[model samples]
Target: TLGEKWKSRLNALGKSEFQIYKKSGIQEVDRTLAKEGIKRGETDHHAVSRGSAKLRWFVERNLVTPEGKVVDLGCGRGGWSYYCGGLKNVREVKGLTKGGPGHEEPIPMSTYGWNLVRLQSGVDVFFIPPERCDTLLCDIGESSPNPTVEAGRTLRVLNLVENWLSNNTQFCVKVLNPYMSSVIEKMEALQRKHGGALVRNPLSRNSTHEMYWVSNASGNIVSSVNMISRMLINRFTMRHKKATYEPDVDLGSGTRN
Candidate 1:
């Protein structure tokens, strides 16, 4: 019943807000709400709209080319994988997840919901290296559900980023904003130890989540960091309006008021 109650609570926020909350990765919805000055039990329509602004910031910039081979780790629901895979010129998209309850084959693409740690050790034949993979996308798990597992997963993902990525490979990572400082510190050390640079964009205003763009590619750090910095500067300065929802007229439903 708790799950059903939670679903009902989320649905009451309307489709856009609810979906954004769900797609926020490891970031908690309540954290996002709190940042927006949303009181408890209040709906914040702009939550998703602002999220979309950040999403567009990355999508419009085209970090991964259409003809690139991309791999999405911890690809929940496969939405990100499907989006990248659907690109006209995208060569391949592979998703890896530590399968669990409620996991389903949502995307008709290559996915391995098994021992990713083993995959990291070059034990899996299907596992592709950075030289072959153009991009790596990882939205690691949260600390609440399982802090130990989350920490281990984050470390493993970082390992892959540091060792696997080639000079031409790029990675887009979503890390919990509250713990971002620590992650960035670790990333900086990793960059220094290995040869690479890190760039990032603030995912939300109240700092619910953040996106990091890392690349071993030459000249990518300056470009990506500058672009994200500009996007954040514009976003914080200007408040974008929320999107409106309209019911389907063909279904005889009136516009949602």
Candidate 2:
């Protein structure tokens, strides 16, 4: 019954769902699902992996060390938190959320819940301690459609980083490319005050999501040599050719996804 209901919903979505998921850069997975007569929803394995790939880059690189504590700000569903906690060196991984639909109960490692934690309020206001976590994973503004609202969220996250992050902390953040300019400018403004640099790594060449590796290191934050080498090797490891998918609706100013 649930399967049929889901199929009905997918059928109702028709080509629009295909285009949306494709535009999100999961074209191959979407086509595979289409061939298998299954719906390519957000919770699907391929979709979840695609979304979490940016965070995985940091994990694989050992950038987020296990020796230090991790705090996943605005962690949705605790996918990243679970991944972090499973690592060998990480002592504890705590996820902070505003408690959305599937997030009412604690998910795995992220047992701590908060009510809209803001930068102005201290870190002690929630889980763990203030200025303790050496690694912070934040994926905010993923659903916000308004650029102004997205910009405000980005600024708030940066403020938290400045006020609470350790000198050698590695902060991983994801933001929509539409509002990325605002994020860039905010990072620039915080450079002098915070003494760190933001190293941006686009999730994919064409994906709307971008990952920023923030560090308080004054010199190069991410190793250019390492990045180039990985990019070259990634052609075979996680490579996919681009596919054509036209958006029926304009992705202009007010577009959400």
Candidate 3:
């Protein structure tokens, strides 16, 4: 019954949106959508569009620097990777993708692409070094429907971030927005409590509370409870222990209407 209802709505949408379905033409795209499990709701499209805007803000802010390298995690379609990879200031860019049909393949002509290494679904971090990159850009967004797995994935990103950054390394990350303000707060609080400094920027006015976390890599072990217990903790240890130059940005304090 649900499938039939969905098919009906999909067919109706095809009447207005699909290229061929606009007229008495082949419904190949409709067939394609049916086969691909793409639904007609605005949820997924909203998420991706908001997520892409958030990612672009991170890159445009120079949150990922030019000195070392930029590694784009879950880099589907490689749009951000391609743009940042082309930056003359950046020495290299590396993207790790799950190689989905919707993603962009590595461009052969770029320097960042030249050093680009592609991997399958899961990634290995032990072999990857923080020294190789000045900044890491992770656009990993909100948790999925599976609460346990979603929590685990969130933890995985935190752990990897902690392990990968050296002192003063910067990482720009996207987390569930306004709806999960508690979650975002907890994450940011943990980073600060550990002597790691964090700065947040919002990309859209209507954005559902998505947060951008730019943290110093040096203070990797700081925990919320620990920071609370040790009030004397060196809060600037991460920023002070810089081996290389970190870019400074000034986004005026104005609301994005």
Candidate 4:
């Protein structure tokens, strides 16, 4: 009766653009092209992946931490898990996802096939079994069926906080930039309604239309990327931020099917 209601609503509304990504199908080639830099459309995938990869490498090579647990949330196909796991500071590399090959182990990529919107059984593996992590990395923003769905959006955020976040947890979350006020409003609601220390600090990146919000404890939030390199590449950037989130306000409560 509890999560069931939300489940129905979620099913009715459907999966976000990022969630419905099919590795094989007509659009498979298109997604591949987009990832490989052939698509005419501009997204921050290039800057985030390559740039983040370099940054992680530097951290691994130079700044070593004796121990820390790292989890990559919504790690599609496990590429990020594979890359980040190689870091010396990472004592454990956990990849939480509903599907995708990358998180499966001897690589021990801990795959959790559960929707973030639901707070019950399916999602329990990501939280209950493990309390929290030192570095909880997530790229969960664009995966929404529609970024405009504020009420549904709230459930996802609340579920994350309730089920996963410890009082002292810090989240290195990446949100897609250039969204409408709906996103900001929802984020603000999260700030007001949630129960932990949260900060929505912005980071400047090579992305033209994209930005990353490192929502973590204010003390730990940081921008380690090279700002100079980002500025130099601004001219060649094609992606421009757009504000276009509009959702059916009739839906006021969480329901997933």
Candidate 5:
């Protein structure tokens, strides 16, 4: 019932929000919601849109460079992985995702179609690092009823790969904005630990409270969180190479917003 409630909440939001559902005929898309009849380009339209904005936000701000070896934990449909894989000078982009209770798979029409290396195993089981991982990305939220505890456990798992994350590495993660103050507090203890001054960029102002945190990223950089209200919805890069870049952004501050 817990997960079901979460589903209803998400399903209700996808109706009118372009950032939640595909604007085209296929209204809802996900493993459970409208799992059937989800067009090839329909599923993850929102994520791909948000993903590109977030990715571009990180790139322009130099938060996380997709260059060199990059790894994405739970990269659904490989949006970030696919985009990063296509980046020039990037040797490879590795992503670990396995369809299950909370994890979502691409519509049956498409599978393993993304350009990145898909690692379907859990992080602890089969993470054999390459020569190096210049950047690591993770989009959190298990869609579990208890969103609070999930954040702690997710961050704990991230610590499992701490050895690979030296000071030179870049780390990025999506966290609950409402509960982020505590998580942000937890991040500060990492001063002498994992890495840089963690910066928070709230994802959506309308209904979503999720935010992305980047470690070792310059706090001086600007964020597009406020810009999403007027930003145009873009196409998913998983299907086409013509992924949209960051739009005409203003001098919006990253820390304050």
Candidate 6:
């Protein structure tokens, strides 16, 4: 299966750093952090959100050649989709995203924006999409500056993707606010639940605060406050309606009591 193959590939690649990162340009990790004023255990307000070409190479090792089945979630500009499709051995590349409904042409955000159509039932509408992938890339790296909001957005995207994930699927995810308390709180829970060893991609950009996490497996999305509150309200109304009525005592005319 594609999943088993990619899992083996990732295990083998775990032994060393990517050879591609040996290039001089990829050696700026320490320097970039210093420039970004990122301390050892603290975060600064300068975290930006952007994804780049090199980011693809970071997870390329996990993609097995010859029959690679990859899903590009949130593929902005569809660059990653194009790149994978052009690969000599990739079997297929399907990008799952939802651009705004009134997408303006010529340069609509649909190519790679937050456009996975979701419904009031909390079900992301993607039944017709490819149902499996050895490698799934989720690129929700937008930084809304507000970590709380970004965290919610990222988690919703995760929830959306969960509907399509398989047990053998490996994951590559990009996001802006990995350090946000809410983000980490939920993310870590998902990771731990999914048999994950969540770690930051060493090659992530220092400028955008772009954080990448890869996992061998990836789940029920934690409920949002709105979801919880809505349920609460519904239950209250249900109980209220019940409380407003009284049941009459049953009186049988003929029985063998």
**Best candidate (score: lDDT):** 5
User: TM-score for model 1?
Assistant: 0.47
* Clashes found in each candidate (C-alpha, N, C closer than 3 A): 2, 2, 6, 15, 0, 6
- What lDDT is reached at residue 145 by model 3? 38
Give the alpha carbon lDDT tens digit for every residue of 79-125 in model 6.
44544443444566666555555421111122221132111221233
Candidate 5 at residue 200, lDDT? Answer: 43
Output the TM-score of candidate 4: 0.41
Cα lDDT of model 1 by residue, 52-134, tens digit:
23333455466434236777666554445544543544566676665455543322222221111111111231254544677
**Model number with the top TM-score:** 5
Task: List, residue by residue over 17-72, the lDDT tens digit for candidate 2.
Answer: 43443234332222344223213232222212233445555556654453457777
Q: How far in Å is the alpha carbon of 251 misplaced in model 4?
A: 46
Worst 10 residues of 6 by lDDT: 248-257
Residue 146, model 1: Cα distance from true site in angstroms: 11
What's the CA error at residue 155 for candidate 1, in Å?
Answer: 3.5
In model 6, which runs have C-alpha deviations exceeding 4 angstroms? 1-52, 60-67, 99-130, 196-207, 216-257
Cα-lDDT of candidate 5: 0.47
Q: Candidate 4 residues 118-184, lDDT tens each?
A: 1111222334354566655555543333434533543454456445545544344443422334444
> Cα lDDT for residue 217, model 3?
36
The runs of at least 3 residues in candidate 3 whose Cα sits more than 4 Å from the true structure, single-residue gaps closed, are 1-56, 59-66, 100-131, 145-149, 177-190, 193-209, 216-257
> Which is the better candidate, 2 or 5, if ranked by TM-score?
5
Query: lDDT per model, in order?
Result: 0.42, 0.44, 0.41, 0.36, 0.47, 0.42
In candidate 3, what are the lDDT values of residues 113-167, reduced to their tens digit? 3333332343433345544567677666553433334445665666566665566
- Candidate 5 residue lDDT tens string, 132-226: 58887777554344545655654654454454566677777664432333444555554457654434442233233354657645332123322
TM-score pick, better of 2 and 3: 2
- Listed per candidate, the RMSD to the true structure in angstroms reads 14.0, 14.2, 17.1, 15.6, 11.9, 25.7
Which residue pairs clash within candidate 5? none
* TM-scores for every candidate against the unseen true structure: 0.47, 0.53, 0.47, 0.41, 0.54, 0.48
lDDT of 2: 0.44
